[PDB]
Amino acid sequence: DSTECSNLLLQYGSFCTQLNRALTGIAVEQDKNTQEVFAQVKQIYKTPPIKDFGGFNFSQILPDPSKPSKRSPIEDLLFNKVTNGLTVLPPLLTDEMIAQYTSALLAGTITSGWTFGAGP
Amino acid sequence: DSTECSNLLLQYGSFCTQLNRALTGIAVEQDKNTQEVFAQVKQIYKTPP
Amino acid sequence: QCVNFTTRTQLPPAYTNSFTRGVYYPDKVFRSSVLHSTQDLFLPFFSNVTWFHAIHKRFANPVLPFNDGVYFASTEKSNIIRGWIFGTTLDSKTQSLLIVNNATNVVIKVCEFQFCNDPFLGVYYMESEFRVYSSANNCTFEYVSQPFLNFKNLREFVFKNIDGYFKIYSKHTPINLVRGLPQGFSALEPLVDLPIGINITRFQTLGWTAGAAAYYVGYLQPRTFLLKYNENGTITDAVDCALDPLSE
Amino acid sequence: QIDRLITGRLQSLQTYVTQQLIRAAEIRASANLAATKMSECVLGQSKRVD
Amino acid sequence: QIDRLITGRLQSLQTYVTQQLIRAAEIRASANLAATKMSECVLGQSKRVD
Amino acid sequence: TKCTLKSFTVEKGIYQTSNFRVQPTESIVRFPNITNLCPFGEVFNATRFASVYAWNRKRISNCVADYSVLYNSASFSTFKCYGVSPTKLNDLCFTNVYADSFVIRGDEVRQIAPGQTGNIADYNYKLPDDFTGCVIAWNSNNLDSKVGGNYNYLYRLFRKSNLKPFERDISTEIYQAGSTPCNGVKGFNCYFPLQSYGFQPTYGVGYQPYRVVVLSFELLHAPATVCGPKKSTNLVKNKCVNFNFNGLTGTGVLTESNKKFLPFQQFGRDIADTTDAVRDPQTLEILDITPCSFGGVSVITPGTNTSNQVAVLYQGVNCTEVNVFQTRAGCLIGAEHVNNSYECDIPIGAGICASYQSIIA
Ligand SMILES: *[C@@H]1O[C@H](CO)[C@@H](O[C@@H]2O[C@H](CO)[C@@H](O)[C@H](O)[C@H]2NC(C)=O)[C@H](O)[C@H]1NC(C)=O
Ligand SMILES: *[C@@H]1O[C@H](CO)[C@@H](O[C@@H]2O[C@H](CO)[C@@H](O)[C@H](O)[C@H]2NC(C)=O)[C@H](O)[C@H]1NC(C)=O
Ligand SMILES: *[C@@H]1O[C@H](CO)[C@@H](O)[C@H](O)[C@H]1NC(C)=O
Ligand SMILES: *[C@@H]1O[C@H](CO)[C@@H](O)[C@H](O)[C@H]1NC(C)=O
Ligand SMILES: *[C@@H]1O[C@H](CO)[C@@H](O)[C@H](O)[C@H]1NC(C)=O
Ligand SMILES: *[C@@H]1O[C@H](CO)[C@@H](O)[C@H](O)[C@H]1NC(C)=O
Ligand SMILES: *[C@@H]1O[C@H](CO)[C@@H](O)[C@H](O)[C@H]1NC(C)=O
Ligand SMILES: *[C@@H]1O[C@H](CO)[C@@H](O)[C@H](O)[C@H]1NC(C)=O
Ligand SMILES: *[C@@H]1O[C@H](CO)[C@@H](O)[C@H](O)[C@H]1NC(C)=O
Which fold has domain C14-248? Predict the structure, then answer.
């Protein structure tokens, strides 16, 4: 809150503008990264109620309806095992949205193979 | 080897720690690069005589 | 009034290991569940500290150089140690400290005293014998505070002269080992700071019978520690950054 | 003295932003690789070895 | 005098570490490409043109 | 937004323009209790004072001196300082204070000053030319004077050499006015050095006794045990204020804390080595200091060719501390929250997006 320090800091030009601009570029690039990784399908697919996949069992990778976050057991294990003018900006996609995107990808690749990645 | 210069340098904080940490990261990164290029098989094969 | 003693049996002082004691709070700052590293005058772990014995005949009251920092440990029972002597030459030519604890309260005085070559007390089994000085010419600061007080009780003390502030640290520790120091960790809290602002480079610890008494002397050295603060804010463990490579 | 503090803290901030940009470039390369893996291994079957 | 020398040499060292990090990122990209070539051309036959 | 982008036309998007800062309202200072007052009552209003040739030097140290009470007392007819400022006594610090108390005539008061030549200055009490401090004098007609003449107070009248600074002379050696030898026996030109004062109440202004106490400061390398008083204001909590606690100054919001300090500890620091809790010197309680709720201000706008309506996001700011809707990204004002879901147009953060259809969130 020092006024004399800020008065001196105006003599240094637009260094602060450069740093804020670079950090803003990094911040939007993180969201762009998450979009390009996960938001690859515009149809949200759901798995059928009957899990008859010819003996194949996807319960460890499919979402658990019991959990409040609707995460898979492996996803829940991953989230459990990974633990002055500065502000932390929240990501655009929440963990629930990324879980829904992953769930849509899993449902598409289980019920439709590779066809959902190239069209209907 | 100057102790007065090092005492004055300590007042600049942890710049030296950052530079050493970055250089160490680069150094281990080179070894990781070599491992990932060449050590792709854990099996040593020999051509027949 | 001073008296020479000659019934002592001559014996060199012993040395003993320091173990993992001697860590004190470097500042008045609270910390919780964090690891803090600081550069301050610290006693290296597992060093030889001077050992002084008093038993019957031993009555060790030598005069030692202060250097830049001194560690006092005292496996003390029935309170045989009653004071301390701090100064440069310990006579009326110069100015010294008088830090004592008699039967009523503790007195801190900064005066030009005339100390005896053999300063000692005496208890009749009631104390009525005070032989620690012969004159007191010029005082410059007087201070009265609250009293600080098989070997049962352990007293730890650290003394420093940094920029005219005389920092005293202390802890009372319940011990049950008879002969030597115990093994364990104990953080020393700051008890009193004395704004003395004087030169100090030498000090002394304060028929007949020699009561069962013992104490230790260690020295403080500039180095770096890594101190662990728990949730309640007490220093539970410490790491000397220059002791051995694992700690480094 | 304030100018000395300003240039020191400004140098620290610029060093932080520069290393953040470098880490962001590395993370962006990793995320582009992750998107490529998502497209070619999840949305299809890949003939590329390893 | 020592402060002048310290700020100059620290600026030089930071600059050196900055281009070292940038060249390390470039070399890491090249090594990732080389590992991909080793996997897809040495350990298999590639359909990717050129 | 136009000013920040330096253009009159702004395309659709969200732009960080300003930085929100909750300005401090009050200025709070707490300092510990004013204890250990200096024993000024046994000095400046004692029973009897000393003579000028044998002045008692009283040393004041290891206490706080409240110069306001002494300065506001109107009975001191002369309160003159020569090296410091009277209005700054309550802020400056000094190692120790030496009080030189003596009794002289009402006209000889001025001679206790640098650069003055006289009987009192040369033979009774001398100050250095680089003297600092204050010379305080007050009338003592009703205490020292007696109907039969107060002859107790003696002063040195003849000495062979001038006095050095702060030098006493308690010897009664016989002065030799002429050149004839004197071995301590009075003669034609040999008189006693010390003379008694003729203090009588009937005399006017000029002969009345004055009790004069002179304070001199020392600036040695020892700590300044003598400092001025401290004025602690009231405590206001749960507001962004300016706090200065025993030299630790800054800005924050002060609330009650469940952390338990050890009794010696005063300050508290977190993992990042920033102050987060301080113990109040007046009342032994621990106040958690959270920073005042700053945040980056972002402006959400469609293209200026479409509309001039804008929405404002205060990133990481609670809506109660600033069409007012609370998101996990911050407080969003100017956008009406809808319960329906669309495709993202302008990203806000934490799953929220803004679009123009009025601006909807
Ligand atoms: C698919 O796999 C899951 C887990 O691998 C099976 O769930 C187990 O079911 C048995 C009996 O129903 C329980 O004793 C186990 O505790 C379950 N495992 C877990 C991790 O909960 C499930 O039965 C399999 N088959 C189907 C059709 O879902
Ligand atoms: C106890 O012994 C010491 C050491 O012999 C005495 O200290 C000396 O005293 C004489 C005076 O008799 C001085 O001339 C010496 O300079 C002193 N020595 C030192 C090293 O200072 C001490 O006086 C003795 N105590 C009594 C009461 O005589
Ligand atoms: C301490 O000193 C004694 C003799 O001076 C020596 O025998 C001992 O080994 C020393 N202690 C250590 C830990 O070196
Ligand atoms: C302890 O020392 C103080 C300081 O001189 C004195 O006033 C007091 O009477 C002493 N008490 C005893 C029991 O000797
Ligand atoms: C110190 O004491 C001696 C003897 O008691 C005395 O001559 C001298 O004046 C004293 N010093 C001061 C500064 O009073
Ligand atoms: C203190 O006195 C010692 C002599 O015992 C001397 O070596 C040292 O230089 C003195 N230090 C200061 C600061 O006067
Ligand atoms: C901290 O103090 C509380 C006192 O209620 C105690 O219950 C707790 O065990 C202490 N913490 C540790 C790590 O001992
Ligand atoms: C004399 O001075 C002392 C200074 O501490 C003061 O407390 C006292 O009130 C004064 N006496 C009178 C009668 O005002
Ligand atoms: C200071 O004064 C306050 C208010 O009277 C009191 O609560 C407190 O106990 C006093 N003492 C200390 C050491 O703070």
Answer: Jelly Rolls (2.60.120)
